[PDB]
Amino acid sequence: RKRIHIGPGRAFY
Amino acid sequence: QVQLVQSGAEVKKPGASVKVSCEASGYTFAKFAIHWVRQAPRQGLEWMGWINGDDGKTEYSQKFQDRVTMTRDTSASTVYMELSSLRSEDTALYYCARAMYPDTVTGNDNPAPPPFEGDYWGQGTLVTVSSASTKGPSVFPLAPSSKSTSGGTAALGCLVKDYFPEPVTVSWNSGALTSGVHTFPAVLQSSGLYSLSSVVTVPSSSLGTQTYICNVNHKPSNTKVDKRVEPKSC
Amino acid sequence: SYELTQPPSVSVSPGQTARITCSGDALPKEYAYWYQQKSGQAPVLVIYEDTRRPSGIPERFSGSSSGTMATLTVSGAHVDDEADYYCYSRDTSANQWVFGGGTKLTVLGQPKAAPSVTLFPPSSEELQANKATLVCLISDFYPGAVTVAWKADSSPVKAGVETTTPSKQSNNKYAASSYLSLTPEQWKSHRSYSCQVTHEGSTVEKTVAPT
């Protein structure tokens, strides 16, 4: 649902 | 089996630099980034930055962007964190914590929400910024006595005297004895040196047949001391 | 900018619900994470992704998030839930993670408790090393305020006393320690030494003497 930050330069939308 | 083991505590001078190491084990080192958060005495947590295990790409906090640099060893499965321009206000406990989410997106895959992979922190590394030099501890046994017995229970321990800097960790019987152990917080003496005590509440019946040995660990001085605590002649 | 703000202290009675609300403008589109930190321990994550518990956390811990507010809820609080609680979320503008200032959770109505005192004389090894330290250990008292007084025979001691400030134990009571430094001659020349520990209408005094 909400954003998920993995690391520097990696995300999920 | 996931473990993050950090380097030992140390004293460093104002203006010098520290580099703490954070060694990972129990998971694929490439699929996880590693955070660094510190906590000064009696203050709150503050995020410093994180770095991925594979590409080594870093991202720093706005407070530390000037003085912190983070690196990693691809082969050694260890991330590092260096802070220059140290002041007394940088005396803190420095943690490393594995990121909550693994890298699922880089691989060839149509959308898949990366799952929460657990809460995993290192043990922390205390960095004391001071001009005082390191000093190892003097360990003395606190023997059990009749005037120190509360029925079926008796008190015994070890005095860890005059060390600097913090911390000292104490175990008993090489970590095999855990229950009834109370390691008290250290006192900052007028001389500027620390002292603490660790005591075990043991059954008073066993005193003639159980062996009690305190294991003192003072990483800043690279010193370990074991002391066998026995009943006295009195 | 951006910041997460939470109250400094929250008091709750044993058995009712405590609520720690973290406020942040990015909370509508950013998850909130909650850390519990007990006295002298590393942070423990109790709520991830606004409302989920890491496996191993009691279900009396719950979390929510609506608008600019994310709330950690402890339903039926134990005394063991006294700790510092930190919210933790993403600062997209500055591209950094941020912690809240922290909230101390005070469980009210904890009863008074008298201290347990153990007094150790100088070890023979330290005496043969030309030093002498008396060790007075104080534990399992509440609230965390004590007075430590030392005696040589019956007279008050004027120097050589070092006493810690009380800190919380894992059992949520308080512990402290007091050290009296003597020369080996002062130790053997007196008939006894005493550690007198006073705690709100109760006093426990232990005494040691040269064999």
What are the percentages of helix, strand and coil residues in chain C, rounded to 5? 5, 50, 45
Q: Are both B213 and B189 inside the same structural domain?
A: yes
- A2:C90 CB<8 A: no
**Residue C94 contacts A where some CB pair is shorter than 8 Å:** no
Contacts of B48 (CB under 8 A, 6+ apart): B35, B36, B37, B38, B60, B61, B63, B64, B68, B81
Residues of B in contact with A7 (CB under 8 A): 33, 50-52, 57, 59, 99, 103
Q: Are both C132 and C209 inside the same structural domain?
A: yes
C193 - beta bridge partners?
Answer: C152, C208
Q: Are both B102 and B147 inside the same structural domain?
A: no
Q: How many CA atoms lie within 13 A of B5 on its CB side?
A: 8
Q: Are both B147 and B229 inside the same structural domain?
A: yes
Measured between CB atoms, which of A8, A11, A12 is closest to B51?
A8
Contacts of C123 (CB under 8 A, 6+ apart): B140, B141, B142, B143, B159
> What is the domain count for chain C?
2
- Where are the extended beta strands (E) located within B40-177? 46-52, 58-60, 68-73, 78-83, 92-98, 125-129, 138-142, 149-150, 153-163, 169-172
Q: Which two tokens stand for residue B134?
A: 């390191």
- C177:B49 CB<8 A: no
d(CA B59, CA C164): 40
Contacts of B165 (CB under 8 A, 6+ apart): B9, B10, B11, B126, B128, B130, B132, B134, B194, B220
- A3:C90 CB<8 A: yes
Which amino acid makes up residue B9? A
Bridge-based pairing state of the strands C103-107 and C9-12: parallel
Please name the residue that has the structure tokens 């933790």: C88
Q: Are both C50 and C120 inside the same structural domain?
A: no
**Resolution of the entry in angstroms:** 2.2
Residues of C in contact with A12 (CB under 8 A): none
- B33:A7 CB<8 A: yes
Please name the residue that has the structure tokens 């009210």: C108
Q: Are both C95 and C149 inside the same structural domain?
A: no
CATH number of the domain at B209, please: 2.60.40.10
CB crowding B169-201: b at 16 or more within 10 Å, else e: ebbbbeeebeeebbbbbbbeeeeebbbbbbbbb
Determine the length of chain C: 211
CB C174 within 8 A of CB C167: yes
Q: Are both B102 and B8 inside the same structural domain?
A: yes
- Domain C-terminal end among B131, B153, B184: B131
The technique is: X-ray
Q: Are both C70 and C173 inside the same structural domain?
A: no
Number of continuous H segments (helices) and E segments (strands) in chain B: 0, 19
CB B215 within 8 A of CB B226: yes
**Residue C48 contacts A where some CB pair is shorter than 8 Å:** no
- A8:B103 CB<8 A: no
- B33:A4 CB<8 A: no
**Cα dist. C78→C10, C58, C72, C82, C175 in Å?**
14, 11, 15, 8, 20
Tell me the nearest-neighbour CA distance from B122 into chain C, angstroms.
9
Q: Are both B188 and B77 inside the same structural domain?
A: no
Q: Are both B8 and B97 inside the same structural domain?
A: yes
Q: Are both B26 and B109 inside the same structural domain?
A: yes
Q: In degrees, to the nearest 5, what angle opens at C-alpha C54 toward C-alphas C49 and C60?
A: 95
CB B177 within 8 A of CB B210: no
Q: Name all chains with 3 or more CB-CB pairs below 8 Å to chain C.
A: A, B
Number of continuous H segments (helices) and E segments (strands) in chain C: 2, 18
Residue B38 exposed, middle or buried by CB count within 10 Å (0-12, 13-18, 19+):
buried
**Residue A11 contacts C where some CB pair is shorter than 8 Å:** no
- Domain C-terminal end among C109, C136, C155: C109
Q: How are strands ordered across the β-sheet holding B169-172?
A: B169-172, B212-218, B223-229
Q: Scanning every residue of chain C, which has its alpha carbon at the shortest distance from the alpha carbon of B234? A: C211
Q: Which two tokens stand for residue A4?
A: 């998920």
d(CA C88, CA C97): 7
Q: Are both C97 and C116 inside the same structural domain?
A: no
CB B219 within 8 A of CB B8: yes
Q: Scanning every residue of chain C, which has its alpha carbon at the shortest distance from the alpha carbon of B196? A: C177
- A6:B101 CB<8 A: yes
Q: Are both B123 and B143 inside the same structural domain?
A: no
Q: Which two tokens stand for residue C143?
A: 């609230």
Tell me the nearest-neighbour CA distance from C91 into chain A, angstroms.
11
What phi and psi values does residue C163 have, to the nearest 5 degrees?
-135, 130
> What is the domain count for chain B?
2
- Domain C-terminal end among B98, B131, B164: B131
Contacts of B206 (CB under 8 A, 6+ apart): none
CB B192 within 8 A of CB B164: yes
Residues of C in contact with B51 (CB under 8 A): none
- Domain C-terminal end among B113, B131, B149: B131
What phi and psi values does residue B207 have, to the nearest 5 degrees?
-60, -25
**Cα dist. C51→B120, C7, C8, C18, C156 in Å?**
19, 20, 22, 16, 58
Q: Are both C175 and C162 inside the same structural domain?
A: yes
Q: Which two tokens stand for residue B155?
A: 């008190």
Interface test with B, best of A2, A3, A6, A13 (most B CBs within 10 A): A6
d(CA B82, CA C97): 19
Q: Are both B67 and B173 inside the same structural domain?
A: no
Nearest CA among C139, C149, C146 for reference residue C115: C139
CATH number of the domain at C75, please: 2.60.40.10
Helix/strand/coil for B173? helix
CB B46 within 8 A of CB B37: yes
Q: Are both C72 and C120 inside the same structural domain?
A: no
d(CA C118, CA C115): 10
Q: Are both C91 and C71 inside the same structural domain?
A: yes
**Residue A10 contacts C where some CB pair is shorter than 8 Å:** no
Q: Are both C47 and C95 inside the same structural domain?
A: yes
Measured between CB atoms, which of A6, A11, A12 is closest to B99?
A6
d(CA C72, CA C18): 8
Q: Which two tokens stand for residue B18?
A: 């520290």
Determine the length of chain B: 234
CB C34 within 8 A of CB C74: no
Cα end-to-end span (Å), chain A: 8
Q: Are both B98 and B150 inside the same structural domain?
A: no
Tell me the nearest-neighbour CA distance from A3 into chain C, angstroms.
6
Q: Which two tokens stand for residue C139?
A: 């534990």
CB B44 within 8 A of CB C102: yes
Q: Are both C2 and C105 inside the same structural domain?
A: yes
Domain that holds residue C64: 1-109
Q: Which two tokens stand for residue B192?
A: 């500027």
d(CA C3, CA C15): 32
Distance of CA C35 to the CA centre of its chain: 17
Helix/strand/coil for C10? strand
Q: Are both C54 and C153 inside the same structural domain?
A: no
Residue C73 exposed, middle or buried by CB count within 10 Å (0-12, 13-18, 19+):
middle
CB crowding C76-97: b at 16 or more within 10 Å, else e: ebeeebbbbbbbbbbbeeeebb
d(CA B55, CA B103): 12
Q: In degrees, to the nearest 5, what angle opens at C-alpha C198 toward C-alphas C193 and C201?
A: 140
Q: Are both B113 and B142 inside the same structural domain?
A: no
Interface test with A, best of C27, C31, C48, C64 (most A CBs within 10 A): C31
d(CA C77, CA C10): 12
d(CA A4, CA B99): 11
Measured between CB atoms, which of C49, C120, C208 is closest to B116?
C49
Domain that holds residue B105: 1-131
d(CA C7, CA B66): 30
Q: Are both B114 and B219 inside the same structural domain?
A: no
Q: Are both C80 and C129 inside the same structural domain?
A: no
Q: Rounded to the nearest 10 degrees, how much is the dihedral formed by the CA atoms of C33, C38, C42, C44?
A: -30
Nearest CA among B93, B94, B97, B92 for reference residue B121: B97
CB C5 within 8 A of CB C25: no
Q: Which two tokens stand for residue C21?
A: 């609300």
